[PDB]
Symmetry: C5
Subunit: 23 residues, 5 copies
Protein backbone atom coordinates (compact mmCIF):
# COMPACT_ATOMS: atom_id res chain seq x y z
CA UNK A 1 0.00 0.00 0.00
CA UNK A 2 1.16 3.57 -0.56
CA UNK A 3 2.18 5.37 2.61
CA UNK A 4 -0.16 7.89 4.22
CA UNK A 5 2.48 10.47 3.38
CA UNK A 6 2.49 9.58 -0.34
CA UNK A 7 -1.32 9.73 -0.40
CA UNK A 8 -1.33 13.12 1.33
CA UNK A 9 1.33 14.50 -1.01
CA UNK A 10 -0.76 13.27 -3.94
CA UNK A 11 -3.82 15.08 -2.52
CA UNK A 12 -1.77 18.25 -2.03
CA UNK A 13 -0.45 18.03 -5.60
CA UNK A 14 -4.02 17.60 -6.85
CA UNK A 15 -5.32 20.54 -4.82
CA UNK A 16 -2.63 22.81 -6.28
CA UNK A 17 -3.43 21.57 -9.78
CA UNK A 18 -7.04 22.51 -9.13
CA UNK A 19 -6.02 25.95 -7.86
CA UNK A 20 -3.97 26.56 -10.99
CA UNK A 21 -6.81 25.36 -13.22
CA UNK A 22 -9.46 27.58 -11.61
CA UNK A 23 -7.42 30.78 -11.27
CA UNK B 1 5.55 -7.43 18.31
CA UNK B 2 5.69 -3.63 18.19
CA UNK B 3 2.46 -1.61 18.02
CA UNK B 4 0.23 -2.43 15.05
CA UNK B 5 -1.32 1.04 14.96
CA UNK B 6 1.34 3.44 16.25
CA UNK B 7 0.94 7.20 16.02
CA UNK B 8 1.42 8.66 12.56
CA UNK B 9 4.66 10.44 11.73
CA UNK B 10 5.04 14.12 12.43
CA UNK B 11 5.43 14.44 8.66
CA UNK B 12 1.98 12.89 8.23
CA UNK B 13 0.34 15.19 10.78
CA UNK B 14 1.82 18.30 9.13
CA UNK B 15 0.94 17.11 5.62
CA UNK B 16 -2.61 16.59 6.90
CA UNK B 17 -2.71 20.22 8.11
CA UNK B 18 -1.27 21.44 4.82
CA UNK B 19 -3.83 19.36 2.90
CA UNK B 20 -6.63 20.79 5.06
CA UNK B 21 -5.50 24.38 4.49
CA UNK B 22 -5.29 23.99 0.72
CA UNK B 23 -8.66 22.23 0.60
CA UNK B 24 -10.35 24.85 2.77
CA UNK B 25 -8.86 27.59 0.58
CA UNK B 26 -10.35 25.87 -2.48
CA UNK B 27 -13.68 25.42 -0.69
CA UNK B 28 -13.97 29.19 -0.28
CA UNK B 29 -14.37 29.75 -4.00
CA UNK C 1 5.03 24.14 30.72
CA UNK C 2 4.38 21.12 28.49
CA UNK C 3 7.49 19.02 27.87
CA UNK C 4 9.74 20.19 25.05
CA UNK C 5 9.85 17.38 22.47
CA UNK C 6 13.11 16.00 21.04
CA UNK C 7 14.75 18.17 18.37
CA UNK C 8 12.63 18.40 15.24
CA UNK C 9 13.90 17.05 11.96
CA UNK C 10 14.75 19.44 9.15
CA UNK C 11 11.71 18.02 7.31
CA UNK C 12 9.42 18.83 10.24
CA UNK C 13 10.72 22.39 10.56
CA UNK C 14 10.26 23.07 6.84
CA UNK C 15 6.79 21.50 6.77
CA UNK C 16 5.78 23.56 9.82
CA UNK C 17 7.00 26.73 8.07
CA UNK C 18 5.00 25.77 4.97
CA UNK C 19 1.91 25.15 7.12
CA UNK C 20 2.39 28.56 8.78
CA UNK C 21 2.63 30.33 5.41
CA UNK C 22 -0.56 28.71 4.19
CA UNK C 23 -2.38 29.55 7.41
CA UNK C 24 -1.16 33.15 7.13
CA UNK C 25 -2.40 33.46 3.57
CA UNK C 26 -5.76 31.87 4.37
CA UNK C 27 -6.20 34.23 7.31
CA UNK C 28 -5.44 37.46 5.49
CA UNK C 29 -7.30 36.53 2.31
CA UNK D 1 21.54 10.26 -9.92
CA UNK D 2 19.78 7.26 -8.34
CA UNK D 3 16.03 6.90 -8.91
CA UNK D 4 13.98 9.46 -6.96
CA UNK D 5 11.74 8.42 -4.11
CA UNK D 6 7.99 8.67 -4.57
CA UNK D 7 7.98 11.59 -2.16
CA UNK D 8 10.73 13.46 -4.07
CA UNK D 9 8.77 13.09 -7.30
CA UNK D 10 5.58 14.46 -5.71
CA UNK D 11 7.46 17.30 -4.01
CA UNK D 12 9.07 18.19 -7.33
CA UNK D 13 5.66 18.39 -8.96
CA UNK D 14 4.35 20.51 -6.07
CA UNK D 15 7.34 22.83 -6.50
CA UNK D 16 6.61 22.98 -10.24
CA UNK D 17 2.97 23.89 -9.65
CA UNK D 18 3.86 26.69 -7.22
CA UNK D 19 6.46 28.01 -9.65
CA UNK D 20 3.81 28.03 -12.40
CA UNK D 21 1.43 29.91 -10.10
CA UNK D 22 4.20 32.45 -9.34
CA UNK D 23 4.81 33.00 -13.04
CA UNK D 24 1.10 33.31 -13.85
CA UNK D 25 -0.14 35.55 -11.01
CA UNK E 1 26.02 16.86 6.27
CA UNK E 2 24.86 17.42 2.70
CA UNK E 3 21.18 18.31 2.42
CA UNK E 4 18.71 15.69 1.31
CA UNK E 5 16.81 16.09 -1.96
CA UNK E 6 13.67 16.34 0.19
CA UNK E 7 15.16 19.26 2.13
CA UNK E 8 16.18 21.01 -1.09
CA UNK E 9 12.65 20.71 -2.50
CA UNK E 10 10.85 21.71 0.71
CA UNK E 11 13.10 24.76 1.00
CA UNK E 12 12.12 25.89 -2.50
CA UNK E 13 8.44 25.22 -1.78
CA UNK E 14 8.67 27.28 1.40
CA UNK E 15 10.40 30.10 -0.47
CA UNK E 16 7.81 30.09 -3.26
CA UNK E 17 5.01 30.36 -0.70
CA UNK E 18 6.77 33.25 1.03
CA UNK E 19 6.97 34.96 -2.34
CA UNK E 20 3.28 34.34 -3.03
CA UNK E 21 2.37 35.85 0.32
CA UNK E 22 4.60 38.87 -0.26
CA UNK E 23 3.23 39.58 -3.72
CA UNK E 24 -0.37 39.07 -2.70
Amino acid sequence: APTKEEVLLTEIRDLLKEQNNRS
